[PDB]
Write a protein that holds these residues in place. Sequence first.
Motif, PDB file in Angstrom:
ATOM      1  N   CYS B1065       0.922  -1.085   0.088  1.00  0.00           N
ATOM      2  CA  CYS B1065       0.052   0.026   0.181  1.00  0.00           C
ATOM      3  C   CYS B1065       0.699   1.202  -0.123  1.00  0.00           C
ATOM      4  O   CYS B1065       0.905   2.160   0.980  1.00  0.00           O
ATOM      5  CB  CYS B1065      -0.938   0.257   1.022  1.00  0.00           C
ATOM      6  SG  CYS B1065      -2.304   0.860   0.641  1.00  0.00           S
ATOM      7  N   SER B1066       1.623   1.473  -1.111  1.00  0.00           N
ATOM      8  CA  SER B1066       2.648   2.406  -1.310  1.00  0.00           C
ATOM      9  C   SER B1066       2.304   3.811  -0.550  1.00  0.00           C
ATOM     10  O   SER B1066       3.455   4.512   0.094  1.00  0.00           O
ATOM     11  CB  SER B1066       3.056   2.667  -2.544  1.00  0.00           C
ATOM     12  OG  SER B1066       3.691   1.529  -3.099  1.00  0.00           O
ATOM     13  N   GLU B1092      -2.689   2.240  -8.087  1.00  0.00           N
ATOM     14  CA  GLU B1092      -2.811   1.509  -7.041  1.00  0.00           C
ATOM     15  C   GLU B1092      -4.340   1.397  -6.759  1.00  0.00           C
ATOM     16  O   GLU B1092      -4.330   0.127  -6.373  1.00  0.00           O
ATOM     17  CB  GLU B1092      -2.205   1.955  -5.998  1.00  0.00           C
ATOM     18  CG  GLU B1092      -1.622   1.246  -4.985  1.00  0.00           C
ATOM     19  CD  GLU B1092      -1.217   1.971  -3.875  1.00  0.00           C
ATOM     20  OE1 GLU B1092      -1.222   3.076  -3.605  1.00  0.00           O
ATOM     21  OE2 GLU B1092      -0.799   1.046  -2.574  1.00  0.00           O
ATOM     22  N   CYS B1289      -6.613  -2.204  -3.910  1.00  0.00           N
ATOM     23  CA  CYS B1289      -6.164  -1.514  -2.298  1.00  0.00           C
ATOM     24  C   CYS B1289      -7.489  -1.160  -1.773  1.00  0.00           C
ATOM     25  O   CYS B1289      -7.924  -0.125  -2.474  1.00  0.00           O
ATOM     26  CB  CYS B1289      -5.275  -0.812  -2.389  1.00  0.00           C
ATOM     27  SG  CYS B1289      -3.299  -1.453  -2.637  1.00  0.00           S
ATOM     28  N   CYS B1292      -5.504   1.987   0.375  1.00  0.00           N
ATOM     29  CA  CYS B1292      -5.374   3.498  -0.397  1.00  0.00           C
ATOM     30  C   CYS B1292      -6.235   4.455   0.162  1.00  0.00           C
ATOM     31  O   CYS B1292      -6.168   5.545   0.378  1.00  0.00           O
ATOM     32  CB  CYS B1292      -5.362   3.368  -1.851  1.00  0.00           C
ATOM     33  SG  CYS B1292      -3.739   2.582  -2.301  1.00  0.00           S
TER      34      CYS B1292
HETATM   35 ZN   LIG Z   1      -2.610   0.883  -1.775  1.00  0.00          ZN
END
Ligand SMILES: [Zn+2]
Lengths: 48, 1858
Positions: B1065-1066, B1092, B1289, B1292
């Motif tokens: 989950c950058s 994402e 995600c 996010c």
């Molecule tokens: Zn993410």
Amino acid sequence: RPITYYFRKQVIRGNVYLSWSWSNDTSVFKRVACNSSLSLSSHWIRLI
Amino acid sequence: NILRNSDYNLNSPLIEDPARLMLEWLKTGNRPYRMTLTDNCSRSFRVLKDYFKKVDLGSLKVGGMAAQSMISLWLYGAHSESNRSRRCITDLAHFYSKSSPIEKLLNLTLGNRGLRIPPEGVLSCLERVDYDNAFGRYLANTYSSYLFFHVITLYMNALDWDEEKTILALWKDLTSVDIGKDLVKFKDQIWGLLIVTKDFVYSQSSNCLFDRNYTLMLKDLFLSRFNSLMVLLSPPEPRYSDDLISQLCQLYIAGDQVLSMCGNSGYEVIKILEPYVVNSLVQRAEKFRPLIHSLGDFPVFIKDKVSQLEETFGPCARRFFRALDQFDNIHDLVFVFGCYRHWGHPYIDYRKGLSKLYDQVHLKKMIDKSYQECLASDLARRILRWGFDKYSKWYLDSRFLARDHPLTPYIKTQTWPPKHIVDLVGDTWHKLPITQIFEIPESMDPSEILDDKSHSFTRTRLASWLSENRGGPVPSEKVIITALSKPPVNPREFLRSIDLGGLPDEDLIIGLKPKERELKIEGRFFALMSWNLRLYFVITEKLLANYILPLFDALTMTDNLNKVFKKLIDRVTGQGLLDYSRVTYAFHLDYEKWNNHQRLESTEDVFSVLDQVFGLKRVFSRTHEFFQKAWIYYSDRSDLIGLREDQIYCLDASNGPTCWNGQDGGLEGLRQKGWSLVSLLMIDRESQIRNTRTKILAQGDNQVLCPTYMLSPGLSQEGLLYELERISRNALSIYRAVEEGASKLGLIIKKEETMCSYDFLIYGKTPLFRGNILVPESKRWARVSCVSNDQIVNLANIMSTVSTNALTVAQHSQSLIKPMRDFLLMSVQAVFHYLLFSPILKGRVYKILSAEGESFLLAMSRIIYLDPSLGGISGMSLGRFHIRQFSDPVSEGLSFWREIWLSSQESWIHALCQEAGNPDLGERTLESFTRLLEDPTTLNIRGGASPTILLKDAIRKALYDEVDKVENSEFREAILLSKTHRDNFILFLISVEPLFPRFLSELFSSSFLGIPESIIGLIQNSRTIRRQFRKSLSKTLEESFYNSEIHGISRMTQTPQRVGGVWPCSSERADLLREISWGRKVVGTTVPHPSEMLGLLPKSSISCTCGATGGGNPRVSVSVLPSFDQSFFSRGPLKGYLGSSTSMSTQLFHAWEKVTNVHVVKRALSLKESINWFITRDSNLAQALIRNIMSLTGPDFPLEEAPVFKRTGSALHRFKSARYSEGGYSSVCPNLLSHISVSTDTMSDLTQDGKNYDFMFQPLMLYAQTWTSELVQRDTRLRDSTFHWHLRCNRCVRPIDDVTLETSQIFEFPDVSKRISRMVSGAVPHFQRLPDIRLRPGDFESLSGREKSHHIGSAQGLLYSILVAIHDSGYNDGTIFPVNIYGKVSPRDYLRGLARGVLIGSSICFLTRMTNININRPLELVSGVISYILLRLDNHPSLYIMLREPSLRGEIFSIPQKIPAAYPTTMKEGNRSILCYLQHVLRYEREIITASPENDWLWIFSDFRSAKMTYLSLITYQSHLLLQRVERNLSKSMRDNLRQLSSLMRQVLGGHGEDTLESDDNIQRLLKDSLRRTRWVDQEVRHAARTMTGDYSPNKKVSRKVGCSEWVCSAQQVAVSTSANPAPVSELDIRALSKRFQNPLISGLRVVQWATGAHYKLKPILDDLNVFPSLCLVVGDGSGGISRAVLNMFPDAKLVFNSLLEVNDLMASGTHPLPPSAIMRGGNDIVSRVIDLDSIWEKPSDLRNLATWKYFQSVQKQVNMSYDLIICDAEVTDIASINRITLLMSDFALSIDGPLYLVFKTYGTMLVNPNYKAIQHLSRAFPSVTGFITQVTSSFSSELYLRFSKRGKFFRDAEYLT
Ligand SMILES: [Zn+2]
Ligand SMILES: [Zn+2]
């Protein structure tokens, strides 16, 4: 048939007036080769 | 004793005087006084004598002839081979193969996105054929020559002997040296033996001599050719041929021949090349719609000039034009278009060009003035209409005006007059004394004025310099230095002085300089003016651009690329449509010397009007007077001036003048905007009198007219040709009128050069072919390694120009794969050059090249892919191709790296990703926090940020320790204030806890400290620095760049940073990375990237398995249309969706200047506007902001009593529409986006519990658009399959969790009003403070639905009508009518509230539109005003969205409503229905409103709770009560009160009146009528959905006690239809049957209409049917109708709608379309017995494709049922479509086994044309047939409803009709 408004005029004592017809030839005409508004004719028919 | 080089590429102009003078010195004598004395030229002359004591001197050639030899030489060696080019391209291909795995990343992201990979291999393009062949010998020789000249230029621009030793150390077997002299030779098998004598070059074989500029030219052209052919090689798709490369080699050799046998004079031929290509493109366009008449004489002009240049100049021009016409494709021709600079640039003849300019300017004319009078009258009419609209106040003064004039009553009553009045005064508006409108500022920001423009000299210093010197060119002074020496600007005082005469005779100098790379032997000339004159021009043009240009739409000067594209699309609708409904001509006008021929007598009255509106007089006029009274000189030659102490008295004025003391005219690059205004006004007048629907585009020179014309959908050949004749007639008439006007203004138009087309357009070298923005790639790949001026050759800079060039290519193009591959290739090429030699590093690198195996791999990957923020400082991630103006590059990069990490199995990529994860953070101290102010969304990094911060800080140091040596007192004191308070204020900003950095940046730049930082960032020129400061700053900067590049290469060769496992989950990683960088939690910057939170693989609506199970799964839906054409001929029906784009990054479609800031005070006021979003009123930060704005003004400032609202329910990264907001740039061309719609209403599920998600949808839309277009064009089968993207995600997604900022620290500001005048004193006008009344509270969440939806409606109506009555831009925004409120609201009360609001809005519009005669007829006025509001609301699109909720539909169609006939329910019909219900509410039920005393209070909401709307709302309510409380005519007291209200809204609504003129009169005038009858709420409408609005009101009504409504039918008739094989034919039957008539009587007797009135015809057949089918398949129909009747008759029946979509651009922006209204008219049971109504558009409708029928079979399988009935009612006159329809219907019925009945509507006329293929093509499953006719059919029509029937498994292979 195509649409042809044949225009002409008349003079009464003194002044003049205009005149139009669908079936005549006095050679000043406006013509169109397509109706493209018959839906409006049907609309008026529904109304009346 | 040291100077910089600052000269690598050819930006300077080109000239032959230096070489000629050096030759004359070499023959004999001393230097001839004009040689730019230096050390370099002296040593060069020494060595040149020492080698020119030979005998060749005497028959030597020079510039203008030197090239002649050279080009011949080059083509010779270019077709000869060598032993050197082999080595070069061998090494290059070795480098590529060593860099091959790099592409894996690209292929991996494309395979994760779901697309194929080109298998040829972009990066191994130089190993298929690049050797031992003609084309590979020409490529290798080109590259080798480029390398040669690169080395030469490096030796030339070097500084010391050490660099030259280094160079010769690198290149040994190529170069040679002779010490004891500076004698360096360079040999080559092609170019012989050159003798680069430091600043000069000499060629022996080609016996000539020349200078550096020619070397730069040749280097540039060789590089252009090489990189162009390189990216041209190995493309993914067959967009081009291979005879494009062969033809382009031929073309270049042809140009070489032209140059070699016609001299520099042959440079007119490429000036003809470009329009030849344009003519070819046009002539290839008309082939698609060849029935319209193409006008003009462009092709005749081209042919004549080709014959001319063929007779003269020899046959070389013939060969050139022949090879040019050899091309046949379109994109190949554009690729030839882009290379009009791949041959060189001409040695200009400045004397010749100046002589021609002198003659063209001094040529007097005999032009008219009445035309200009009418023109300026039109302008004043427009400006006054705009003034009245926005600010309901005229701008005249009846004290100065007459009385026998209709405007003294139309001014005593503040109105606007009608058409006949304005016709009575159509050309007399000048006789009105128009007063000031737009207040000018008493100061201005230096960022808007100061720039490195090479400010000229004045007469005193000019004469002194002439008396002192003996000759040579002038070095001109610089602008920032003159500004720092002199006091700053006070434009009010400056222009008042000019109004008083002013600009004395001394400061009227202009100097010329020849423009660069313009391809004209005469040469253009851009000017540089004096201080006062440049100041005048700049402030004037900025003044116009701010407050005038927005009125006009053609004026494309202050516009960016996205807005340019929007405008083009708006003015090109009607190009390449496949039909004759939208014909748009395009006239490209290019005058003859528009700038010069523009002269005084034309621009007197227009400019006078501008000057009156600014409160001045004659000022603009004086412009040409200045050109009459001004000196004009040439910079590169001074000895020709002989001044007589009164005037110029130029010398040598027989061979051609050079200077003069006056001229009646203008010059290029000056007053482009006013001249564009007058020309545009001319054009608009002529068009608007001939054709009103013309659109215009104008930057001033390359003007474009676009008249559009609509012709009916169904037309016959005769009528069509008649229409097109009239079309051409009108267009030619308008062109003639434009030419007449232009000769009436002296502007001569070239008849045989104006371009005309109907399927083509050009704007600023942007070609638009049939609505498609066609891209030239050659300009941009030619600009590789061609860095800008006043810049350094750093790795970062060349990689940055590469990246931005590729991204602008993508923005001009589609199919991003191609620009990605070009990015890779060009980047590798550039870094190979830079590592071959690094100037600033002063040597070769040797750390990267020597590497092998893996380390070089990591190095290149870090150089290209890593972002400037993530360790590297050079490269860019591919995630910037998706969107350009994204808010956070960190999330983009991290998402890209995560996808590449988990989508792989290799080793080194993991290390690269881990490096990108933890980018080696550093210290956490001061001197780094400042970075957050210059560029937030970044990281405190060990290794420094972009060198901009370094320059700012170094110049800060130099300016702090040398503040005393700036003469001006204001700037001195400002810097003094800076030094201390900058550190202290940064301490305070760090003392703010939550660290919302954007606020801190805007606060730092909004206080006084933005002044010095502003100018300090405005310093970017090396010579500027050298002049102002001393060697300290320059040396420090050079050493800093050295250390920076060292650290850069060390970062690119760092240790692999051993892996530590993938991360989830950058975006969360980015947030915590910022956290551990700057300590505390950070907000705002962390924004997710759609890569994402939308998943990788999209899936079609069919075969996704989600459906409606698992939950309310959200999604982003993508409806693609069947009109998708990958080719470039259609343009689609739609417009597109790109978003907004702020013009703050030098992307204005040109490069002249920028728009960095506006002012510090306006920025501070913006903060005050954003006080309550995330800060509380009684706090320290509010105290700070008030102290700040009071410091930058006097303590007697009328503050605005900052508001009492609370937008607690909102986001935080939506701060301001200034620098970053409105995410979205549409990196892909919008052309394919014409086929696509993108909906987000599914994501409404996210607000099932609310939580204030409020995430930006635009990046989602754009990502989906881009990648679904790519996925469609890679598979042309799914031309109609609506896709839908799911989320991957959930982490996010971020609930906002709204937050606040506060501190205990207080910081006092210093006074800056008594210390700095002339910068801040009067920047912003008055504000007219209003007193507040405390806005008695609401107590809102205590009611039910039925008790308050009335209030919501009244509020929406009031706000909308107000925003319409005052011409705000927010009158057509979706933030007023949201969509999360219709699903839970009472519809009746909602609509009645809308009516209430519209009514009181009509009250305010009545207050405005109040003349002296309309008073005695006020009721009709009220009605007409309501009608006006309802008209504008019909023009509001998004209202029609309310037709999704069935309750609203039932309530809105309970009253009689005209039903539409289109499936994609448009704005027109939907809004017409809503407005018919509203007009029925009014005029029948008005008594119900304004009564029921607990419905009367007016509850206002807080979506626009600013002071402006507030008093307007109270005024509307008061005026509504006053129009009420009345039944008879008015009284004079009522009129007095109404005039007072008018004056009050005039005062509040800006203008130039007194502020309020009282407070007690105000309260006494508004109390007892509005104040105790409003109940304000501190809440927004949207979030009301939480508490009570969300509680649905169950409708506990049932019916209205009406009978069973027994059903009915009518008569019928049967007919027989048999069949057999032979099918003979008669003639009389065809003769009497095949004659289509038309006579509507019975089509009008078909009273009822649902789509067309067809159920009347399809009752009897089914009443005869005897199965009661469970399952019908209706197709081709528009809406309901036949289907609806089917659902009437058979209750136990269901349906498959195959109604076509055919979407139009009149719909909403994103949202999905809604089902057909006819069926939603039916009812709940009938709808539920339809299969799926809210999921039709997700299904295809392409009858001509197979997927539709597979969908039908899928329905048959999923449902435990089998088809029994089919109905086809597709009306078509064409043939192929119905043939396909019948083919697939036959295969379908053959793929049914059970019993079956089919109904086919047909026309008997087609039933005998043997090309119909209906009975013989459909009768392959049905033995039983019967034709049917109805008693209701068009009075003369061969309509047959043929009914087929079968029972199962019959083939009847084929049978014709007997
Ligand atoms: Zn993410
Ligand atoms: Zn799905």
